[PDB]
Design a protein around this nucleic acid. Structure first.
Ligand code: CU1
Ligand code: CU1
Ligand code: K
Ligand code: K
Ligand code: K
Ligand code: K
Ligand code: K
Ligand code: K
Ligand code: K
Ligand code: K
Ligand code: K
Ligand code: K
Ligand code: K
Ligand code: K
Ligand code: K
Ligand code: K
Ligand code: K
Ligand code: K
Ligand code: K
Ligand code: K
Ligand code: K
Ligand code: K
Ligand code: K
Ligand code: K
Ligand code: K
Ligand code: K
Ligand code: K
Ligand code: K
Ligand code: K
Ligand code: K
Ligand code: K
Ligand code: K
Ligand code: K
Ligand code: K
Ligand code: K
Ligand code: K
Ligand code: K
Ligand code: K
Ligand code: K
Ligand code: K
Ligand code: K
Ligand code: K
Ligand code: K
Ligand code: K
Ligand code: K
Ligand code: K
Ligand code: K
Ligand code: K
Ligand code: K
Ligand code: K
Ligand code: K
Ligand code: MG
Ligand code: MG
Ligand code: MG
Ligand code: MG
Ligand code: MG
Ligand code: MG
Ligand code: MG
Ligand code: MG
Ligand code: MG
Ligand code: MG
Ligand code: MG
Ligand code: MG
Ligand code: MG
Ligand code: MG
Ligand code: MG
Ligand code: MG
Ligand code: MG
Ligand code: MG
Ligand code: MG
Ligand code: MG
Ligand code: MG
Ligand code: MG
Ligand code: MG
Ligand code: MG
Ligand code: MG
Ligand code: MG
Ligand code: MG
Ligand code: MG
Ligand code: MG
Ligand code: MG
Ligand code: MG
Ligand code: MG
Ligand code: MG
Ligand code: MG
Ligand code: MG
Ligand code: MG
Ligand code: MG
Ligand code: MG
Ligand code: MG
Ligand code: MG
Ligand code: MG
Ligand code: MG
Ligand code: MG
Ligand code: MG
Ligand code: MG
Ligand code: MG
Ligand code: MG
Ligand code: MG
Ligand code: MG
Ligand code: MG
Ligand code: MG
Ligand code: MG
Ligand code: MG
Ligand code: MG
Ligand code: MG
Ligand code: MG
Ligand code: MG
Ligand code: MG
Ligand code: MG
Ligand code: MG
Ligand code: MG
Ligand code: MG
Ligand code: MG
Ligand code: MG
Ligand code: MG
Ligand code: MG
Ligand code: MG
Ligand code: MG
Ligand code: MG
Ligand code: MG
Ligand code: MG
Ligand code: MG
Ligand code: MG
Ligand code: MG
Ligand code: MG
Ligand code: MG
Ligand code: MG
Ligand code: MG
Ligand code: MG
Ligand code: MG
Ligand code: MG
Ligand code: MG
Ligand code: MG
Ligand code: MG
Ligand code: MG
Ligand code: MG
Ligand code: MG
Ligand code: MG
Lengths: 64, 96, 52, 78
RNA sequence: CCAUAGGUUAAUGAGGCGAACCGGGGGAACUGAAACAUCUAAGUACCCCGAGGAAAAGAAAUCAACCGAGAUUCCCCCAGU
RNA sequence: CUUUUGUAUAAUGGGUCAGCGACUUAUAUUCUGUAGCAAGGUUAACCGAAUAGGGGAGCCGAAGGGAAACCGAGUCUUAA
RNA sequence: GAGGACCGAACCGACUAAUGUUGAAAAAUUAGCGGAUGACUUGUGGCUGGGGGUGAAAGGCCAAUCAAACCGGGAGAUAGC
RNA sequence: UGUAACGGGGCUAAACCAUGCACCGAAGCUGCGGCAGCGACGCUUAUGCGUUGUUGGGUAGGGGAGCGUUCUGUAAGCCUG
RNA sequence: GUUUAUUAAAAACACAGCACUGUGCAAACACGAAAGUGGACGUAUACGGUGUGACGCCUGCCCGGUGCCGGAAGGUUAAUU
RNA sequence: GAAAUUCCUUGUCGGGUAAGUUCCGACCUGCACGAAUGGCGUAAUGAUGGCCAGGCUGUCUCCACCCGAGACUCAGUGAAAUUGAACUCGCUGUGAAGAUGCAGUGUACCCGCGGCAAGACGGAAAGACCCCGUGAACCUUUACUAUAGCUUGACACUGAAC
RNA sequence: CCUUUAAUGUUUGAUGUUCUAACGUUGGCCCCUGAUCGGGGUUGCGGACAGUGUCUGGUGGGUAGUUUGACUGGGGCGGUCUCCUCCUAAAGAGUAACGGAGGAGCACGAAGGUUGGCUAAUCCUGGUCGGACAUCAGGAGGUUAGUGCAAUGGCAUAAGCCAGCUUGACUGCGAGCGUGACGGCGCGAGCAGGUGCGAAAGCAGGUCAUAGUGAUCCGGUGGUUCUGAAUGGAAGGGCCAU
């Protein structure tokens, strides 16, 4: 039958123009007062998935 | 996605965003699509009749992609700045 | 960990706040500092309030 | 019985990252250190953890200068 | 006490069997989750009642979106959205 | 033969022969090869007496950025 | 002429030893042993059904099977061995 | 358990030290014949030919190229009393 | 007397006797979605449950913990409103 | 009361014996008895546990002979477990570390039959001990989460008067 | 018609007494009837109680489904499990053991920024109470002190000590680089806006540095030129801060 998307991965990765995936950085949900503004500011923009993790992401997202 | 029991990547990262219903009913039109319609007037209905946009599309935007070489009248669509320049230079007009 | 979190609320009415900590047993007086409000883009007075 | 030992901290990967004569870009870290075993010379900065880094493109140069025979790192413009 | 219950007789019908398919009344666990309780397996297996050559469903107190469609059923898409 | 750091091993399995005995099937998806067509390619159910022919509903591709509205060869970020 | 009385065959048991251990026998044979009118023993038939029975209680027995019988099904359970 | 602390026989060198020249000794190297992988250089009927250099121990495992078996077409053909 | 049919017959189990406790009869209690049935065609000198175990001499102190029995003024507290 | 309980422990004293870690009688230093999950006694009873004596004996010193049934030979019938393949010696060494099979060496003509079990890590049963598996079962409980039962109240079946 | 206060027809509340007609009857009698079942009738007793349904608090190994970690010179028992500093570690980085030794799970609106100033321990001598050690003066000495807290590396241009003014413990970004399998973590000139100290050059995006920590999910609070299932809103969602 059709392969099923891992819906949880679809909620956290989006495919970019050349075929990588963008994601939201960890560590910006809570416990925020003790973190420096510089650290938080650098966590705000989305990042790309690393080379070692691309395989796991692609496995989870066959219809991406 | 299993990683041996370590919190896997797709769960140690956070979810983001929401999915927009209005994006599903909006389409983009290339300049090369303009000559493909029947009659020289480009609107939602004529694009649907020519199979350029889906039957349930409610909004469309013409973008600068490809070329237009014939005069066309665009009615009821949004047009980018570059596409508007190309259409008018080819001799057409844009009506809101 | 006796120090408690607090917020410093802009006096400009923008709702902007900074957060920090305070030893409430030794310094019961309210913290008040001039800080940059990025909404109105000026330094203004900021006053202590509860963290939420 | 048992032991009261068994602890350690992770290695911090300090030391010299760019040696004498190496061409570097501005911003490059030259040495990571605890305190100033090496001191900042011309076109070199000293960060808050006493990291020495290049403030200009050029070649790394070590020298000993001053009345205390201290070690300085500078960048020679190339 | 009128009656009713009860009793006898007559006429007509029913019962039992059958592989699947069909409608209904009940309804697991192993298993997966790399443990497990929510969840899954699955309204599956199994038990029960009933029908037909098919059954069920069916002629909008339905959708749509300001344009319109026009009962039920079945197939391909929509979309692993 | 197997399993092992390592087996003549006194570790495992087989008395012998003959016959049978273990990476398959369906669907989805990606990559390679090959063939067709090519900014296009291809149809599904179905119709058809038809391995023809019809059927382009659809699907993939020629545009991206952004959570999104939106803008668009740019876009997002930010007062810039 | 009493008795869960006494000695002792049948009958019901099973304390010791030898044998047997691919047995004559998937629990026996031989020499001895206990009860032997009783909470005794035996024939025929009946009743209790599986988380259930029955148990003077050993987790004993429930068809040479018992810390959950047997047969069929879920079923190709699952098996990082 | 039996010599049993040169492998044995035996040895006064057939032991040890030093110097030297011979020889034995491997699937190492060379000679002769043959096969294959890869790379260069040239021909070419564009996929082979020639010259040349070099390589060819292998478990897990990756890559390449084949043998044979049954069945379908080619086959109302071809072989076969 | 009983017991681990098939490695344990015993000091284990049972036992008459003793005590605590439940039970007023549509009894407590037990089997049972229930109807009913056992208890019992019995009725507190009876029936169930539990411990102890002929008989003789006996059975001391502790109610703080856990349980059971009684109390209900107050605190807290469900659906409901 | 050194016990169906006593670790120390064969405690110490007495008795019995030539000699007694057991037995009997005491002592009390009860590791860690004790009063109906009864305490201490107790005639009778027991295929019940321990100890002593008389009788008795092949139990033994220490075995001998005999009678039968096998074993052994002949005729008839005719199994079994096991088994990689065998041209299937000792010793000392070596070595997946305990060798018929390697090394060195010694001994040894080929083949049965009756006997014995030191070795073939002999046969038998995918160790039951031990560990492991994010295995199983059944048991326990003030482990967790549920739940039959039991119990509480509200509403319904459910009405009237004071 | 507003503050307050008496009563009843009158609405439901709790208690008590009485009643009968629902309901119970495993009391008597009659009939179906050849019947210790059942039903109907009648009479007595009980009576809105009891009992049952739905909902609800308590109790509930009576029964069920399960959980009950890993490392480990076998397992158990004991100890350990994240973070920082030294050594082992073989002069770049890294490097194991149930190897050898110590620390953290914070503190601080000043103990942060900046401008100006300053320099320690210890000992000797003299000096009221005053002594081994208080404060004073001089000398020697030269960091043997100090550093908010371990240890190491640093520190005089002090990073150590004192004072004035202050909020840069700023917001948006960031060339380049270090360190990680990854998630991440770290250093960073410089740019824009606004700020403090300084005459000024300048310094300041917390603290001499290296510990002081917790992913995701689920939700809470504030903000918002995003979304808003017919449409306007709203709910819910997104984004930003927490
Ligand atoms: Cu009939
Ligand atoms: Cu209450
Ligand atoms: K389950
Ligand atoms: K599993
Ligand atoms: K399990
Ligand atoms: K094998
Ligand atoms: K093995
Ligand atoms: K092994
Ligand atoms: K073995
Ligand atoms: K094997
Ligand atoms: K494929
Ligand atoms: K292809
Ligand atoms: K912009
Ligand atoms: K009888
Ligand atoms: K039983
Ligand atoms: K049977
Ligand atoms: K069962
Ligand atoms: K060659
Ligand atoms: K043929
Ligand atoms: K007996
Ligand atoms: K017994
Ligand atoms: K009683
Ligand atoms: K007596
Ligand atoms: K007596
Ligand atoms: K008590
Ligand atoms: K009590
Ligand atoms: K109460
Ligand atoms: K004693
Ligand atoms: K004792
Ligand atoms: K003695
Ligand atoms: K008791
Ligand atoms: K007694
Ligand atoms: K006995
Ligand atoms: K006796
Ligand atoms: K030999
Ligand atoms: K033997
Ligand atoms: K576990
Ligand atoms: K079992
Ligand atoms: K009545
Ligand atoms: K009632
Ligand atoms: K209840
Ligand atoms: K329970
Ligand atoms: K170890
Ligand atoms: K060991
Ligand atoms: K080192
Ligand atoms: K300051
Ligand atoms: K200051
Ligand atoms: K990185
Ligand atoms: K919102
Ligand atoms: K709708
Ligand atoms: K909103
Ligand atoms: Mg957030
Ligand atoms: Mg179309
Ligand atoms: Mg270290
Ligand atoms: Mg029928
Ligand atoms: Mg599971
Ligand atoms: Mg489902
Ligand atoms: Mg029919
Ligand atoms: Mg019909
Ligand atoms: Mg109908
Ligand atoms: Mg209309
Ligand atoms: Mg081994
Ligand atoms: Mg070998
Ligand atoms: Mg052998
Ligand atoms: Mg072998
Ligand atoms: Mg094995
Ligand atoms: Mg074998
Ligand atoms: Mg495969
Ligand atoms: Mg796009
Ligand atoms: Mg008798
Ligand atoms: Mg018996
Ligand atoms: Mg006998
Ligand atoms: Mg007798
Ligand atoms: Mg007798
Ligand atoms: Mg069953
Ligand atoms: Mg037992
Ligand atoms: Mg049996
Ligand atoms: Mg079971
Ligand atoms: Mg199944
Ligand atoms: Mg199987
Ligand atoms: Mg000798
Ligand atoms: Mg030799
Ligand atoms: Mg020589
Ligand atoms: Mg040779
Ligand atoms: Mg060679
Ligand atoms: Mg050659
Ligand atoms: Mg070779
Ligand atoms: Mg090879
Ligand atoms: Mg053929
Ligand atoms: Mg019996
Ligand atoms: Mg037995
Ligand atoms: Mg016996
Ligand atoms: Mg009764
Ligand atoms: Mg009843
Ligand atoms: Mg009865
Ligand atoms: Mg007893
Ligand atoms: Mg009390
Ligand atoms: Mg009470
Ligand atoms: Mg003893
Ligand atoms: Mg003694
Ligand atoms: Mg003695
Ligand atoms: Mg004694
Ligand atoms: Mg006792
Ligand atoms: Mg006791
Ligand atoms: Mg007592
Ligand atoms: Mg007691
Ligand atoms: Mg007692
Ligand atoms: Mg007793
Ligand atoms: Mg006694
Ligand atoms: Mg007896
Ligand atoms: Mg014979
Ligand atoms: Mg050896
Ligand atoms: Mg040997
Ligand atoms: Mg022989
Ligand atoms: Mg023998
Ligand atoms: Mg064996
Ligand atoms: Mg095994
Ligand atoms: Mg278990
Ligand atoms: Mg009756
Ligand atoms: Mg349980
Ligand atoms: Mg389960
Ligand atoms: Mg373990
Ligand atoms: Mg432990
Ligand atoms: Mg090093
Ligand atoms: Mg080194
Ligand atoms: Mg290494
Ligand atoms: Mg290592
Ligand atoms: Mg270590
Ligand atoms: Mg500690
Ligand atoms: Mg200064
Ligand atoms: Mg960059
Ligand atoms: Mg500026
Ligand atoms: Mg100024
Ligand atoms: Mg901070
Ligand atoms: Mg400081
Ligand atoms: Mg510090
Ligand atoms: Mg949740
Ligand atoms: Mg709506
Ligand atoms: Mg709306």
């Amino acid at each position: 039958p059709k392969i099923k998307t891992v819906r949880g991965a679809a909620k956290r990765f989006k495919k970019t123009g050349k075929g990588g995936f963008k994601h939201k950085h960890a560590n910006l949900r809570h416990i925020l007062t003790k973190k420096a503004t510089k650290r938080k500011r650098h966590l705000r923009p989305k990042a790309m998935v690393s080379k070692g993790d691309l395989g796991l992401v692609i496995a989870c997202l066959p219809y991406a | 996605g299993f990683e041996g029991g370590q919190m896997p990547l797709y769960r140690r990262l956070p979810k983001f965003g929401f999915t927009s219903r209005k994006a599903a009913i909006t389409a983009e039109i290339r300049l090369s699509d303009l000559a493909k319609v029947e009659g020289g007037v480009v609107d939602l209905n004529t694009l649907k009749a020519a199979n350029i946009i889906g039957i349930q599309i409610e909004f469309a935007k013409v973008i600068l992609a490809g070329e237009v070489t014939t005069p066309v009248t665009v009615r009821g669509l949004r047009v980018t700045k570059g596409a508007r320049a190309a259409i008018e230079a080819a001799g057409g007009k844009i009506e809101e | 960990g006796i120090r408690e979190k607090i917020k410093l609320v802009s006096s400009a009415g923008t709702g902007h706040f900074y957060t920090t900590t305070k030893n409430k047993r030794t310094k019961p007086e309210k913290l008040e500092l001039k800080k940059f409000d990025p909404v109105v883009r000026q330094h203004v007075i900021y006053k202590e309030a509860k963290i939420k | 019985g048992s032991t009261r030992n068994g602890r350690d901290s992770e290695a911090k990967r300090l030391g010299v990252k760019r040696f004498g004569g190496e061409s570097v870009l501005a911003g490059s870290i030259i040495v990571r250190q605890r305190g100033t075993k090496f001191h900042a010379g011309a076109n070199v900065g000293c960060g808050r953890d006493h990291t020495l880094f290049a403030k200009a493109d050029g070649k790394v140069k070590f020298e000993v200068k001053g009345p205390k025979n201290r070690k300085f790192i500078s960048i020679e413009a190339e």
